[PDB]
Amino acid sequence: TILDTSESVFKNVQGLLESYGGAINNLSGQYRVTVEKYSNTPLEINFLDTYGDLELSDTTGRNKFNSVQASIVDPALSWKTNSITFYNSNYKEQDKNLDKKLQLS
Amino acid sequence: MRLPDPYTNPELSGLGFESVNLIDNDPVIRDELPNGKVNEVKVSAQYWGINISYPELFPDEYSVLDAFILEYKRTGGYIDVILPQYEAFRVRGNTNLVNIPAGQKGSNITMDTQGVLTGIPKPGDLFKLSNHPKVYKITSFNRSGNSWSINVYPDLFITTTGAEKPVFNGILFRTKLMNGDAFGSTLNNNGTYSGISLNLRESL
Amino acid sequence: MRLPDPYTNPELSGLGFESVNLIDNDPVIRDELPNGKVNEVKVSAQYWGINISYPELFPDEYSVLDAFILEYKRTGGYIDVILPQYEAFRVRGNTNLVNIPAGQKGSNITMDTQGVLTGIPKPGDLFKLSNHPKVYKITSFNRSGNSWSINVYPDLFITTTGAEKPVFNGILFRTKLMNGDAFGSTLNNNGTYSGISLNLRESL
Amino acid sequence: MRLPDPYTNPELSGLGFESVNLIDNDPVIRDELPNGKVNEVKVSAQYWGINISYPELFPDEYSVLDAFILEYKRTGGYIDVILPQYEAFRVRGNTNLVNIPAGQKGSNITMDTQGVLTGIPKPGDLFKLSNHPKVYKITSFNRSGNSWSINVYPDLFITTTGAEKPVFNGILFRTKLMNGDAFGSTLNNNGTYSGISLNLRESL
Amino acid sequence: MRLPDPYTNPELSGLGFESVNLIDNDPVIRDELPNGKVNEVKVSAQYWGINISYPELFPDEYSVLDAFILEYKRTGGYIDVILPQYEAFRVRGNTNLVNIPAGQKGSNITMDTQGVLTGIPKPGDLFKLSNHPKVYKITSFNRSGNSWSINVYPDLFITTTGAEKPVFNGILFRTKLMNGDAFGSTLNNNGTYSGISLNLRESL
Amino acid sequence: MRLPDPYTNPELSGLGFESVNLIDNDPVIRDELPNGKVNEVKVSAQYWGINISYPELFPDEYSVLDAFILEYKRTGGYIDVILPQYEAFRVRGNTNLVNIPAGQKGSNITMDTQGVLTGIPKPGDLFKLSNHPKVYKITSFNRSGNSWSINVYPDLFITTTGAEKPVFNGILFRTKLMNGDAFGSTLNNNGTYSGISLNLRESL
Amino acid sequence: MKQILDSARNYLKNNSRIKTASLISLELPGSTGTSTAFIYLTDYFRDVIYNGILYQAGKVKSISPHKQNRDLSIGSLSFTITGTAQDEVLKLVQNGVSFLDRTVSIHQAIITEDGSILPVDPDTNGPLLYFRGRITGGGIKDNISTSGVGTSTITWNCSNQFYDFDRVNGRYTDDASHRGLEVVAGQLLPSNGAKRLEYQEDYGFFHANKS
Amino acid sequence: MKQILDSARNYLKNNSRIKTASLISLELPGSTGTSTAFIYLTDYFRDVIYNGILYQAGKVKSISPHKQNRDLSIGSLSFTITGTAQDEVLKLVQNGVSFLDRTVSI
Amino acid sequence: AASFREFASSNSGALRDAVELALNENGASLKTLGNS
Amino acid sequence: AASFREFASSNSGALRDAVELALNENGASLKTLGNS
Amino acid sequence: AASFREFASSNSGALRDAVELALNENGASLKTLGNS
DSSP: OOOOOOOOOHHHHHHHHHHTTEEEOOOSSSSSSSOOOOOOOOOOGGGGOOOOOOEEEEEEEHHOSSSEEEEEEEETTTTTTEEEEEEEEEHHTTTTSOOOOOEEO | BBBOTTTOOOGGGGGSSSSEEEEEEEEEEEEETTSOOEEEEEEEEEEEEEEEEEEOOOOHHHHHHHHHHHHHHHHOOEEOOEEEEEEEOOSSSOGGGOOOOTOOOEEEEEEEEETTTSSOOTTTEEEEEEOOOEEEEEEEEEETTTTTEEOOOSOOOSSOOOOOOOOOSSSEEEEEEEGGGGEEEEEEETTEOOOEEEEEOOOO | OBBOTTTTTTTTTSSSSSEEEEEEEEOOOEOOTTOEEEEEEEEEEEEEEEEOOOOOOOOHHHHHHHHHHHHHHHHEEEEEEEOOHHHHHOBSGGGOBBBBBOOOSSSSEEEETTTOOOSSSOOOOEEEEEEEEOOEEEEEEEEETTTEEEEEEESSSSSOOOOOOEESSSEEEEHHHHHTSSSSEEEESSOOOOEEEEEEOOOO | OOOOTTTTTTTGGGGSSSSEEEEEEOOOOEETTTOOOEEEEOSSOOOOOOOOEEEOHHHHHHHHHHHHHHHHHTTTEEEEOOOOOOOOHHHHHHGGGGGGTTTTTEEEEEEOOTTOBSOOOOTOOEEEEEEEEEEEEEEEEETTEEEEEEEEESSSSOOOOSSSEEEOOOEEEEEGGGGGGOOOOOTTTTTTEOOOOOEEOOOO | OOOTTTTTOOOOOGGGGGGEEEEEEEOEEEEEEETTTTTEEESSEEEEEEEEOOOOHHHOOOOOOOOHHHHHHHTTOOEOOOHHHSSSOOOOOOOGOOOOOTTSSEEEEEEEEETTTTTTTTEEEEEEESSSEEEEEEEEEEEEETEEEEEEEEEOOOOOSSSOOOOOSOOOOOEESTTSSSSSEEEETOBBOOOOOOEEEEEE | OOOOHHHHTTTGGGSOEEEEEEEEOEEEEEEEOOTOEEEEEEEEOOEEEEEOOOOBHHHHHHHHHHHHHHHHHHHTOOOEEOGGGGOOOOOSSSSGOBBOOOOOOSEEEEOOOTTTSSOHHHHHEEEEESSSOEEEEEEEEEETTTTTEEESSSSSSOOOSSSOOOEOSOOOOEEEEEGGGGOOEEEETTEEEEEEEEEEEEEO | OOOOOHHHHHHHHOOOOEEEEEEEEEEEOOOSSOOOOOEEEEEEESSEEEEEEEEEEESEEEEOOOOOSSSSOOOOOEEEEEEOOOOHHHHHHHOOOOSOOOEEEEEEEEEESSBBBBOBBBBBBBBEEEEEEEEEEEEEEEEOOOOSSSSSEEEEEEHHHHHHTTOOOOOOOOOHHHHHHEEETTTEETTTTTSSSSGGGGGGGTTTTTT | OOOOOOHHHHHHHHHHHOOOOOOEEEEEETTTSSOOOOEEEHHHHHHHHEEEEEESSEEEEEEOOOOOOSSSOOOOOEEEETTTTTTHHHHHHHHOOOOOOOOOEO | OOHHHHHHTTTTTHHHHHHHHHHHHHHHOOOHHOOO | OOOHHHHHTTTTHHHHHHHHHHHHHOOOTTTTHHHH | HHEEEEHHHHHHHHHHHHHHHHHHTOOOHHHHHHHH
16 A cells, blocks of 8 residues: 555545455444455344335446456556456356446556 | 412312313333334333313402412412322321431332331322422332332432432422413403413423 | 593493403423423513404494504504503502602512502502503512512513603503404494404514 | 496395405515514505305396306406495585695595585595595595595505596495306205305405 | 233222224235236234223222333333133133144144033134233134144244143233323313223234 | 125124115326316226125124134135125026127127027126126117127226126125224124224225 | 327327227346246236237336436336235346346337227337337335335336446457456456457457557 | 343343433533543433443433444434523533534443 | 425525535535536 | 435436526536536 | 425435436436545
8 A cells, every 4th residue: 555645534544445345333432344254154134023114226237247357556567557357258148248347446 | 389279278269170180291212013022212201291270260269370370480480289189198107207228219119117107008199209399109019017118100210318208298299381381361251261271291 | 542442432332342361472492301300491572462352343333443443554553452450440649759769670679659659559460660661460569668569570671760650550551463464344134243353462 | 337236126136245244455574573573564455355145046136147247257347346334425515626636645635625525524434536446445534624634544556646536425346256267056956046155356 | 910800809890891992903015906906915913902991980990000000111011901701711621631733833723632621612712822922813613523623813923832732711912002101181070080091002 | 705694694684784885996097188178098997896884783793794704814815795786687598508709808798699598688787707707887788689789897807718608697796805904893881893894895 | 200190190189088008028137048038018907919929917007207308318217016926026036137138118009999909100000119228227115014004016227228328348459358368277268258259369469568 | 243242132132111321421612721521411311320420311302313334434423402501502602612622422 | 396396496505505414424515516 | 204215216307406506506517527 | 494404404315316316317426526
C-alpha cells in the first residue's frame, strides 16, 4: 500500500478495505473488523425462527459476468502497468454464449 | 388538598361521584411469532387513570368546585383523591413502630411487624409506602409469626432506605387534571350546571 | 359596541340567552415522563371562550340582531358582553376612591378600601381592572380591616401602575366572532328562526 | 324570469317554499396569535347563498317547474328570486327623482331625497342600486332633513357614476343553480314526485 | 396458574362465564387465480382464541379476580383454563395404561387401549397429549377391538416419542392475555362492575 | 361431501338455510368516454358467490356441522352445495346417450338428443357438463327436432372433447370457505350457539 | 406507425365489450446445455390454442405498462405469477440455474365471440405483439400476518437488449483476449472465449506489449 | 459475532415478559477546561445503580434504531430528551459551549 | 398519481433534504453538481 | 414504510421532477450525471 | 408540510431507491457522486 495523505481519511480507509474485502462495524460498541470467509460451522437458522416476513431478490443481468481483465502496477515492468485477463468456458456455456467482460484495477 | 366530597361536605351531596372508573395503564410492546409464541417487553411506568362523572349541579356546590379547581390551577399543586370502595380498616396498630429493612427492591416486601399489628391485609387491598406517593395493590400475603411478606403490583419504584413505613389506611391518590386544558361548564336556563366530568392521571 | 339584550332593549324579551358555556382555554406544553411524572408549563395567553344559544326568534328581533352583527363586521370593532348571573351585585360603593399600589405582580392583589366599600366578593366572582380589557376570577379573598387581598386567575397580564381602579360590577368581556364567515339562518314554516347561536372568543 | 311561486301561480300552491335558508358567505383568512390577538384579512367577494326545499309535488306543478328549469339551462340566463319575509313597502315615492352624487365608494351612501320620499328604511331592510344586480343590507340610517345617509353591508362593489338610483322595493336576487349539474326527480308509484331541493348562489 | 371458577371456589357463584367464543385462527396464504381456482397453503401455527364475558360482579369476587390477574402480570406466567361444556365426561379409565406407538405423525393417531378404557369419545370432543400443551379436536373416531384410531385437527405439532399419554378429561388450555395494557373497571352506582370480559389467546 | 341439510338430515331442521344470497361476480374494467360512449374489457373468470345464514343452533346439530367443517379443513377437499330453488326435474331421459360434437367452444352448445330426452329446459335453468365442475345458466334454447341448441352464460371454460355429457339434474356447486380463516361460534348461556354464517366462492 | 388491418379497426370501433388474451412464450431458465425448454402461459380465464401451441391458464396475475419515448431507454417491463405454484418457486431457486439471457415474447390477442383469435397484424394475419425481450432478474415476496391472510408473489423483470449499459464489447490488442485463453491442467489453451472460432489460430498481437 | 454467555441465551429463550433498561453515560458539553463532568441517565421507570454509579430516571424519551452494513458509514444515532427540563435547555443554549468532541456510551 | 405529482412539486425541498441525508450518511453530496 | 417503498418505486418519475425543480432553482441538474 | 418533512426524513432510503430506479432506466447513477 501507498497512501496519499491528502485524500480524506474516509476515502483512504474505504479503498484500503476494498483492497481485501474487509468491512468494519461498531455494533456492540467496540470497533470490529470482519473479513469474508467460508466457515465450517455457520449458525443454523430456520424460517420459523423469524417473524415470517421474507423477501428474495435476484439481479443477474447487471451483476453477472463470465470473463475478466484486471490491471496492476508491476516492478517486472519497471512499475509500468500489466493487464491480466481470462475467460471461463463453463460459465460461457451456462450462459447462452453471451460474452460479458468484467473490468478491474 | 382533597377533592371535596360528601364526607368533607355532607351538605353538598351532589358532589358524590355518580360512578367512577379505575384504569390500569401498563404500556407494553408485544408481538406474535409465527410459531405461536407471544413475546413482550416492558418499559415506562404503570400508572392509574381515573374517570369521574357528576350529575346536574346547583350553583352553590358548583361554586365550591370551581373555587377548588382554580386554586389548584393557580398553585400548580396536586389533587388528592379518596376512593371509597377500598375504605376498610381491616389492619390497625402502631404502624410507625414497624421496621422495614433497607435494600428491598423488586416486587416482594418483607416486614417485621414485631407482633404489633392486628388483623391482616387481603388481596386487592391498597398499600402505600410512607415516604412516597405511589399506590400499590396487594397480590398476595403470608405470615411467619411476626414476619410478614407481601407481593405487590406494580413493581416498586424505589429502593428501600430502611426509613420507610407501610400505610394500610387512608391512602389518597395524588393526581393532576389532564382534561383541564379545555375545562368549562354549560349553564342551562334551569339555573343548573351540567356536563361536568373529570379525567385524572396519577402523578408522582 | 354593546351586544343588545333584555337590559338594553327590555321589550325584546326573547333576546336573552337560553344557555351559555363559559370555557377556559389555557394552552400548555405537556409531557409525560417514563417515571410517571407529568410536567406542565404555562405559555401564551389564557383566553375565555363563550358559547351562546338563543331561543327561537321572531323576525323583528332577529333583524335587529342581524343588523348589529353586520355593523360589527363593517366596522371591524369588538363585541362587548356582560354575563347576567355574575352581574348580581355583592360589593357596592365608590370604586373611584379605592387606591391600588403600583408594582403589584403575580396572582395576588392588595388594595386599600379606606373603608368605602360595603359587602365582600365571593369566590367565583368576576374582577376587572379599569384600564385593561382582561377579566379575572376571584379564587379567594382575605380582609384585614379595610385592606383587602385577592387571589385571581389567571395571573395578571400587566404590572400595576398605581392608577388602576377595580371594577366588580358591570364587567364587560371584549370578544371576536368565530362563525362569521358562514353564518346563516333558516326561516321555519311556523315563522321563526331556530338554532341561532354564537361561538365567541376573547381577544386582547 | 322569476322562479314561479304562489303569487305568480296561486293555483299551484305546492310551489310555496316549505322553508328557506339564507346564508352569508364571507370568505376570510384568520389566525390566533399566542398573545391572544386575533387578526384577519379579507379578499374575494361576499355572496348570498340560498337553500330551498319543496314538499311532495303533483305532476302539473312539477311540469311547470321542469319547463322553467330546462328553459334556464338552454338559455344560460339567470334565475330571479323573490324573498317574501322582506316584502314590506315602508318606503315609497318617486325613487327616480332622487340624486346620488358620483364618486361615493366604500360602505357609506349619502343621498339627496329632495324631500320626495315618505317613510324611512329600517335596519335589516334590503337595498339595491338600480344599475347593478347586487343586493345589500341596511346596517344603519340617518336623516338631516332631505339628506339621508345609510351604512350598508357588504362594501360597495362599484364606484357611483351619479346615474344610479336606489331601489327599496321589489328586490330580486339574481342567481344560478350550483346544484344543477346532477339534477333529477324521483317518481313514486303514488304518482307524485319527491325529493326536490335547490341550492342557489347569487351571481352578478 | 389455574383460573378461579365455580369448580375451584364454588361459593363465588357469580364467577362463571355468561358467554364464550372459541375461535379458530388458521393463518394462510390465499390466492385467487384468473381461472377461478382458489389456492390455500397452511403455514404458521393454528391457535385458539377465546373471548369470555362475565356477568355483573360484586366487589369481593371482583377483587379476587383482580388480584389473580395482577399476580399473573407480576409473574409473567401462563393462564390455564378448562371449558366446562367439553368437561362433561364420556371416556373414563386409567389413561396411564394406554400406550401410544412412537413415530406417529400427521393427523391420524392410533393407540392400544388394552381394553382398559370405557365408552368412546364423540366427534367434537377435546384431546390432548400429556407432554405438550397443545389441544386438538376429534374430527372422527374408529374402533377396532381395543385399538383406537383418531383423526384430529390441527395436525400434530410433534412426532410421538412413544412416551405420551392421552388425556380426555380436565384438559387445560395455556393462554396469554391481550387486554392487559389498558384494563379497567367501572363501579356502577348500584354497586356492581359490568362489562368485565377477556380476550385470551393460546400461546405455545 | 354435501353440506348437511334437511333433505339429508330431516331431524336437524335447524340446518335449513334461513335465507341464501347468490351473487354473480363478473370482474370487468370500464370507462366512460366524453362523447358518451361506454367501453369495457373483460379478463378473469366469472364466479358464483354464495352467502348463507343460520338461526340459533342446538348443540347436536351444531356438533354435526363442526364435525363436517373440521373434516373439510383437515382434508383440504371441496364443499358440495345444493340449491333448492332450482330443484325441478323438467328434463329427463338417458342423458348418457346424448352426443355432443367435439370442438364446440364459446357460448353456444348444439346437441343431438337423438329423440331421447323428454321435456325441455327453461331460461334460468342450471346446466352443467359431466366432466367439469362448472355451473352455467341457460339464457336461451331452441329445437329443430332431435337437434337442440342452447346459449349459455358465462362463456365456456373448456373446449369440448366430444366425451362430455350434459347434466340437467342434481347440479351441485363445488366451493370452498373464504370466511373460514377466522371461524368460530359464540356460546350463550341458553345453551345455544349463535352468529354462524358462511361465505362461499365456487372453485374449480 | 404500424398499419393494422382495417377490419380490426372497424370491429373495435363498433363493439363495446371486448375480450383480450395475453399470450406469453417464455424460455426456461437454467438450461445448463444450450438446448432449452419453453413454457407457454396466458392470463386468460381458460387455456387457449394458437399455431396449435396450447397455452396454459391461471399462473399469470398481472403485467406492467410499457413506456418508450424519443430518448433511448431499456424499456423495462415486469410481470407477476402466483407465489403458491410450487413449480415456479423451484424454477427460481435451483442453485445451478443461469438465465443471463433467456428470451420472452408477449402476444396480445383480440378474442371474438366464437373463441377465434381476430386477425390484426397484416404481416402474420394474426395477433399483435405487446412486448419482446430478455429476462434480467426476478424476485419473491412472502408476507405472513400473525392472523388473517398472507400473500406470496413472484416477479419477473424484463428489458431490451441494452439491459446493461455498462457493457463494453470492443476488441483490443492482446493475444490472450483475441484467442480466448484459459488455463487447464497446467497450460494455456484457446477456448470458447474467442469472438470467433477462427481467431484461436491467430498468434497476432503476440509481440505487441513489448513492441 | 460476539459470543454471549449462554445463561442469558437460555433465560431469553424461556421467559416471555422481559424488562430492559437503557443506561446512558454522557460527557457534559462545554467544559471550557479539559476536565469535564459526566451525567448519567436512564429511560427506565426508576433510578438504577450500576458499578455503584446511580443513573437518574425520567429525562429520556426515545432512542433511534442503529444500522450498519458491509459498506463504511457514520453509523449515526439520535436520542431525545424532554424539552421541559429547564436545565437541559440551559445545557444547550449557553454561548461559551463547545462539544466538538464529547463522548457518549449506551 | 397526478395528485402526488402536484404535492411533491409543491413540497420539493423536503425531498432534497432527505436525499442529502442519505448521501451524507454514505459521505456524498449534490453540491458536487453545483460546482460541476 | 414498506407500502411507501412500493408506492414511491411505482411513482419514481414525479420525485425526479421535484428534485430537478429544486436543483434548477439553484441552477443545477442531474443531466450532468447523464454525461458524466 | 412539516409532517411530510418529518416522514420523508424518516424514510429517506426509499426515495433514494426510487431516484436510482429512474436514473438507471435512463442509464445513470448517483455512485458517480460517490467517486467524484
